[PDB]
Design an enzyme around this catalytic site. Structure first.
Site, PDB file in Angstrom:
ATOM      1  N   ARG A   1       0.787  -1.227   0.000  1.00  0.00           N
ATOM      2  CA  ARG A   1       0.000   0.000   0.000  1.00  0.00           C
ATOM      3  C   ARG A   1       0.820   1.279   0.000  1.00  0.00           C
ATOM      4  O   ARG A   1       0.231   2.353  -0.150  1.00  0.00           O
ATOM      5  CB  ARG A   1      -0.944   0.013   1.210  1.00  0.00           C
ATOM      6  CG  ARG A   1      -1.707  -1.289   1.381  1.00  0.00           C
ATOM      7  CD  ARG A   1      -2.200  -1.485   2.800  1.00  0.00           C
ATOM      8  NE  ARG A   1      -2.524  -2.885   3.050  1.00  0.00           N
ATOM      9  CZ  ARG A   1      -3.327  -3.309   4.016  1.00  0.00           C
ATOM     10  NH1 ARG A   1      -3.914  -2.466   4.849  1.00  0.00           N
ATOM     11  NH2 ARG A   1      -3.547  -4.614   4.148  1.00  0.00           N
ATOM     12  N   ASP A   2       2.141   1.219   0.161  1.00  0.00           N
ATOM     13  CA  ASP A   2       2.958   2.423   0.223  1.00  0.00           C
ATOM     14  C   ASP A   2       4.214   2.254  -0.628  1.00  0.00           C
ATOM     15  O   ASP A   2       5.333   2.524  -0.181  1.00  0.00           O
ATOM     16  CB  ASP A   2       3.305   2.768   1.673  1.00  0.00           C
ATOM     17  CG  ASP A   2       4.018   4.102   1.807  1.00  0.00           C
ATOM     18  OD1 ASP A   2       3.833   4.967   0.927  1.00  0.00           O
ATOM     19  OD2 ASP A   2       4.763   4.282   2.793  1.00  0.00           O
ATOM     20  N   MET A   3       4.048   1.776  -1.861  1.00  0.00           N
ATOM     21  CA  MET A   3       5.168   1.686  -2.791  1.00  0.00           C
ATOM     22  C   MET A   3       5.762   3.062  -3.050  1.00  0.00           C
ATOM     23  O   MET A   3       5.040   4.014  -3.363  1.00  0.00           O
ATOM     24  CB  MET A   3       4.725   1.040  -4.102  1.00  0.00           C
ATOM     25  CG  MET A   3       4.387  -0.439  -4.006  1.00  0.00           C
ATOM     26  SD  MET A   3       5.552  -1.480  -3.083  1.00  0.00           S
ATOM     27  CE  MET A   3       7.166  -0.910  -3.632  1.00  0.00           C
TER      28      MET A   3
END
Ligand SMILES: Nc1ncnc2c1ncn2[C@@H]1O[C@H](COP(=O)(O)OP(=O)(O)OP(=O)(O)O)[C@@H](O)[C@H]1O
Ligand SMILES: Nc1ncnc2c1ncn2[C@@H]1O[C@H](COP(=O)(O)OP(=O)(O)OP(=O)(O)O)[C@@H](O)[C@H]1O
Ligand SMILES: [Mg+2]
Ligand SMILES: [Mg+2]
Lengths: 83, 638, 184, 638
Positions: C50-52
């Protein structure tokens, strides 16, 4: 010699299932968080006949497979470099 | 459509070859099954005596005897168990995959409080791994003594016995194969018994031929001496812990580990449920000299089920950083393979693994309340606690509290991080730590001058591993780990201090440019120091680069990759003391002349001193040495 | 005797936005390949990231790449977050194709060396356009030696339609065919 | 006496339970056995057609087809192999421990090319690991089509089959248990086949879900998936080496390793004699970024027996310093256990280990003859060679010749030790080497001053692993490895040189004694230097003690206690330059006044400087820095 009971076991921190390009600690934490999430949603959904079947078919885990049989821990008092 | 139904069949001759050659990897396991069956018979005869003592009229002594004989090559085991009737011997010995023990248990009532080993019914045939011909002598009270014999040729012979009345039990006779004569050497029998059958429920005797003169010299020489100490160490883990004295624990530890010193502590615990087992752990008093040596065995925790040995060094049950733990574990329900060597579900090991680590952590927590013993524990095993920080990311938080260090206010005592935060002022937000080689070096460094004079305690790092542990240990109890050797060392200062610092920058601005252009590439920036009080200048490191002690450790590892060392190499910054007299003189001289060769030499020598004072190794010690040789020539007048 | 070493590394964000290390074309392609592989295995185990961003992915020793390296071993950073995640319309807009878009921004960093929408100093204004579909990664800023296959791949990944963004095995298939044509 | 003879018997139900639950730890093996049996049937019909080409009139295409069906949960295996007659059907599926394949090769004469794997006659029953009921369609050329069905309940049903005509082959349909839908996953099937049956010599087609993009005028494309081969990578190792080109090797290596680059080199060979096996070896063009990460698979050579995968990593195959080697090994004669997952005899493995290590050493020797490729090899894998020096006792001799090093006269190109043996002076007896951190730092050292001025070549040592080498690499081609950083540095000297040395000792003896008094314990002795020209003095080590770099390497390790290893730390000796003007003037000052504070300050400063030029750290950098800061105040008149 029925061994069907133990064949369903899920252990997160397993090095055998690891990917060389993923941080092993992060992957273990992700698996653990997924386990926590699935057991927390399962109980909320629990609070029905089809519901009864999936609990019996879950892989057993460290938390649910067994419980502690209490015994004693001790400290040995002996003089180091005695007189 | 017409359906034909038939029952499955089996080929006996091929089945014998399969069970002989493809079942058991190790030949020595043949003895384990024989002792297991003897214990089975002894438990059977014992249990019926609990209801009718008159059963033991044929014999009251429960024992097993091993009588090797090199002359005829016969390895004979005699036990006083239940024995066999003719129906029993044919039904059990002639039927593969049939175990009389399992039928016996299924005949017994629920909750018999007796657990037995064999279930598969094929363990007995393992004797053929080393024996070519098997003769069995048995006698049940309700029957006569009979003779059983086979050569694994698919048929066996049964006949009545009129020899010596054995009374009660069984006598197994194995004619050893010619090239398997090494099993007649008493030493290997002792080793095998201790390795596999150390904790059987009945005493095992061993009769050895030691003396050849029979009842000759002055004294009377006896050809055979009965040796009993084969299973003397009784499994104290079976008993309740509350009834075990500390001396008993020490004796068990000494017997198991052959140590002459006692343990440091004992952890005993059991687990109940679907996976039920008992565990007994010990902490050695001295760290082994080969604790972290690579070529050696990973773990020393032995695995047992129903008091029989399974695996000695199972890599799956404990991590590396807890390899020093000594102890044994026994279970009753593990699903074994056909050879009782592996588990049919390997993930069971990783379930036992999870609890034992927690128990070891609890035990190590239970040691800290006594500082004196915990001091010895820390002295012997500081490395193991630190090594577990870097790899066991799961238990990092708990393991952090077990750490002790010398501090700038702890004196010679090692102090915990909890004491460190407890002694901190309200205004400080960070744990100031310094890495180095020795306590005196880090104490006498020029960086800690203003840090110490403002009353802020500093942890001293002296071990090489300290740089690795602080990498993951970014913050403890919400307090950031800040190294004062790096740039951006923030100290809480008043308005007057800030104004004085700004005046220092504006006064020394052009001088900083003079340094920067003089040194060219070796220093990225020259700034007025906010951490020095007496020393004119120092070399600080970048915010996110490698620390001074760090790169030395990195530069000294033998097997690291050099393709990356370019990236995290920190950039050197030269901090300058505003109030030093020498720096003021150099400022005046540079303002007078920007091209003074003497000023250039002073700046270069001063930076060379700064690198040495900050711990950095000189890029070329030779040029610095030549400069100092030139200078002392001037000081002397050469 | 000899002793061991352990896990230490540095991120793409520091390397390219601070150190600005001149990665070779094949090196950037290799980071692309390893990131795609690590994403696929994450998706192969039905796991979602969710936080690439370059902050959460690190170059380890030997140029090893370790996803999940929160440190050496979405906090703003919306330049990687996909537009459908940005509007917050869905209860969980995070998806495999949102990760495709974020990894496409990763390829944008690989092939441009500069943050997308660099001409903008306001984050909320970036929010307003990229959420509404007004702003796209400027694909003209890719390097001049850029092969066409990767260029089309990053175009597909930064496509605003989440369903059109091809799924990660297709990404790896696209890279390998170009990768074997690299020595040209 | 009455002797009764009985034949051994077996219990069918317990034997079935043992086969199901006890022999196989992982359930995925059931695919392996099914593919093995299908390939057995295909090879059977192939060999039959080699004699009678009309045998294939019922079917020409030889393959195995997999038809997973998620809707019905039926995992359908169809192969075009040999069918069953009713007698063959019953004798092969109803009889435990009976292998029709075993009977097949026992029927065949010697000399036939046979790769049969099915011997134990029990692999088929492994289907019950995941399937509750087994459905079999069979059709032999000489018989009709029949149905066989059982649920492992000890009985099976046989009837004629009248469904879809199979022509020839066998159709196995497994009713997979509800908890095991994982084996219907296309990714799971691909993983299993590539892991176990990747190199089966027949096309394996796997048919899966529809390929439809839904927009009749709508697009439908294919209403199924036609995948034609998963074993596309043929076992090139089975082919002769002479007929394989570089592109074939590169494609094979890229297929196995998923690498995008080619190999650096390939070595293909077989071993014949009392044991037969083949081995194909690849060396990557780039070092694996995790070569010495110890938490993962140590050895990366995969093992095959009769072209079916056995195990991926055994520590008895290759050592740690060969972890970078890539390749596979296939054999034909190893006796596996019943589970085929572990080799019962470990004695063979050590012979294979020896042979593979020898042949890898040969391959590395081949690389050295081509400098540029060998220069890439050395750059990428220099560390592993030196680790092989450290640990591989036997191969240290050949492993040493593979080392390339920069020397004082080699410029930028690295040179082998043998090239140094190409360039002795006739009097020179020792291979002089100097250790350090960088090439420049050792290029201009004060120790190498006289060594360079006398025309003796020296070797520059810059990697931390090098000090481990010189510990083991004591002599090379009978020439000792002597460091000039140690005491007792014996350099060819003439009569004038020794005469001057004795004169210098006599002249400077008193000065030597006074510096010995002042420096006290810090130096074990002070002697006049026979190696210095420009430096007035430098620090040398003991004859058998550590060098400064060596001591730094030992104390920088994070897992070793320096207190235990500290006994060996070398004594420091101060070697003073007799001809230096500074030394002579200090001698004059000391003779004029022995208690001069200036003299003691100069000598302590000079010793502190000499420590730095010798690679040693200062016991306290702060006091040295304060000494400089005080002094240069005198220069500034402060
Ligand atoms: N000394 C003995 N006392 C009692 N029964 C015995 C003895 N020796 C052999 N038997 C009987 O013969 C059968 C022996 O074999 P085996 O040792 O083959 O079976 P197990 O011990 O019952 O099972 P497993 O094969 O799992 O160990 C046993 O199951 C037991 O019933
Ligand atoms: N699909 C098949 N095609 C041809 N023969 C088959 C097939 N399935 C089973 N059989 C026959 O059934 C007999 C039994 O085999 P199983 O597959 O039971 O063991 P194996 O293949 O004989 O040996 P192992 O147990 O060592 O794997 C085999 O020997 C083989 O001849
Ligand atoms: Mg048995
Ligand atoms: Mg089989």
């Amino acid at each position: 010699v029925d061994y069907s009971v133990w064949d369903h076991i899920e252990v997160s921190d397993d090095e055998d299932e690891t990917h060389p390009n993923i941080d092993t600690a992060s992957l273990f934490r992700w698996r653990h968080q997924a386990r926590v999430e699935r057991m927390e949603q399962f109980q909320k959904e629990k609070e029905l006949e089809e519901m009864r079947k999936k609990e019996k078919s879950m892989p057993w885990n460290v938390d649910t497979l067994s419980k502690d049989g209490f015994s004693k821990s001790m400290v040995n008092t002996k003089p180091e470099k005695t007189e | 459509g017409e359906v034909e139904t038939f029952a499955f069949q089996a080929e006996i001759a091929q089945l014998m070859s399969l069970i002989i050659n493809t079942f058991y990897s190790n030949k020595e396991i043949f003895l384990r099954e024989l002792i297991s069956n003897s214990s089975d018979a002894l438990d059977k005869i014992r249990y019926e005596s609990l209801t009718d003592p008159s059963k033991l009229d044929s014999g009251k002594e429960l024992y097993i005897k091993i009588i090797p004989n090199k002359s005829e090559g016969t390895f004979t085991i005699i036990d006083t168990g239940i024995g066999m009737t003719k129906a029993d011997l044919v039904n059990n010995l002639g039927t593969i995959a049939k175990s009389g023990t399992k039928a016996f248990m299924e005949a017994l009532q629920a909750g018999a409080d007796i657990s037995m080993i064999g279930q598969f019914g094929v363990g007995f045939y393992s004797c053929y791994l080393v024996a070519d011909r098997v003769t069995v002598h048995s006698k049940h009270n309700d029957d006569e003594q009979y003779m059983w014999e086979s050569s694994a040729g698919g048929s066996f012979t049964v006949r009545t016995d009129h020899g010596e009345p054995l009374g009660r039990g069984t006598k197994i006779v194995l004619h050893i194969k010619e090239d398997l004569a090494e099993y007649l050497e008493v030493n290997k029998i002792k080793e095998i018994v201790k390795k596999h059958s150390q904790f059987i429920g009945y005493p095992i005797k061993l009769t050895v031929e030691k003396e050849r003169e029979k009842e000759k010299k002055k004294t009377i020489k006896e050809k055979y001496t009965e040796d009993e100490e084969l299973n003397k160490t009784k499994p104290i883990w079976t008993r309740n812990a509350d009834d075990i004295t500390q001396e008993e624990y020490g004796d068990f530890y000494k017997s198991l580990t052959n140590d002459w010193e006692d343990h440091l502590a004992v952890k005993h615990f059991s687990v109940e449920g679907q996976l039920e087992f008992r565990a007994l752990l010990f902490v050695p008093r001295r760290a082994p000299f080969d604790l972290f040596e690579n070529k050696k065995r990973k773990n020393n925790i032995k695995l047992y089920v129903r008091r029989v040995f399974i695996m000695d060094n199972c890599e799956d049950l404990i991590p590396e950083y807890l390899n020093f733990i000594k102890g044994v574990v026994d279970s009753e329900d593990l699903p074994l393979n056909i050879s009782r060597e592996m588990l049919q579900q390997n993930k069971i090991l990783k379930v036992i693994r999870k609890n034992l680590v927690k128990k070891c952590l609890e035990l190590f927590e239970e040691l800290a309340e006594d500082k004196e013993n915990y001091k010895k524990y820390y002295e012997q095993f500081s490395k193991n606690l630190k090594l577990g920080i870097h790899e066991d990311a799961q238990n990092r938080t708990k393991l952090a509290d077990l750490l002790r260090y010398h501090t700038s206010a702890s004196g010679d005592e090692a102090c915990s991080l909890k004491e460190y935060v407890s002694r901190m002022k309200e205004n400080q937000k960070h744990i100031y730590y310094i890495t180095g080689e020795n306590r005196d070096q880090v104490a006498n460094s020029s960086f800690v001058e203003r840090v110490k004079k403002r009353g802020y305690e500093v942890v001293y790092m002296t071990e090489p591993i300290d740089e690795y542990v602080v990498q993951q240990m970014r913050e403890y109890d919400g307090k950031t780990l800040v190294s004062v050797t790096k740039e951006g060392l923030e100290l809480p200062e008043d308005e007057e201090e800030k104004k004085k610092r700004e005046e220092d920058k504006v006064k020394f601005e052009g001088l900083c440019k003079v340094m920067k252009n003089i040194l060219d590439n070796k220093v990225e920036k020259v700034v007025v120091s906010n951490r020095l009080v007496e020393s004119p200048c120092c070399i600080v490191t970048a915010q996110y680069g490698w620390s001074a002690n760090m790169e030395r450790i990195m530069k000294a590892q033998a097997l690291r990759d050099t393709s990356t060392m370019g990236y995290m190499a920190a950039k050197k910054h030269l901090e300058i003391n505003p109030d030093h007299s020498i720096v003021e003189t150099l400022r005046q001289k540079a303002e007078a002349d920007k091209n003074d060769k003497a000023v250039k030499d002073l700046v270069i020598l001063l930076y060379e001193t700064a690198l040495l004072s900050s711990g950095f190794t000189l890029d070329e010690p030779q040029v610095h040495a030549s400069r100092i040789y030139r200078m002392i020539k001037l000081g002397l007048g050469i | 005797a000899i002793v061991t070493q352990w896990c230490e590394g540095s991120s793409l964000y520091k390397h390219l936005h601070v150190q600005e290390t001149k990665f070779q074309m094949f090196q950037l392609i290799d980071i692309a390949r390893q990131t795609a592989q690590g994403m696929d295995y994450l998706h192969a185990k039905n796991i979602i990231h969710r936080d690439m961003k370059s902050n959460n992915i690190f170059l380890h020793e030997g140029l090893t790449v370790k996803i999940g390296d929160f440190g050496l071993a979405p906090t703003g950073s919306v330049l990687w977050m996909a537009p459908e995640v940005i509007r917050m319309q869905d209860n969980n807009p995070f998806s495999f194709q949102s990760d495709v878009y974020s990894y496409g921004i990763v390829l944008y960093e690989l092939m441009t060396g500069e943050l997308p929408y660099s001409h903008i100093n306001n984050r909320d204004q970036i929010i307003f356009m990229v959420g509404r579909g007004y702003a796209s990664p400027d694909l003209s800023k890719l390097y001049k030696n850029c092969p066409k296959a990767m260029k089309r791949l990053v175009a597909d990944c930064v496509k605003k339609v989440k369903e059109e963004r091809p799924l990660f095995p297709q990404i790896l298939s696209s890279i390998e065919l170009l990768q074997h044509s690299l020595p040209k």
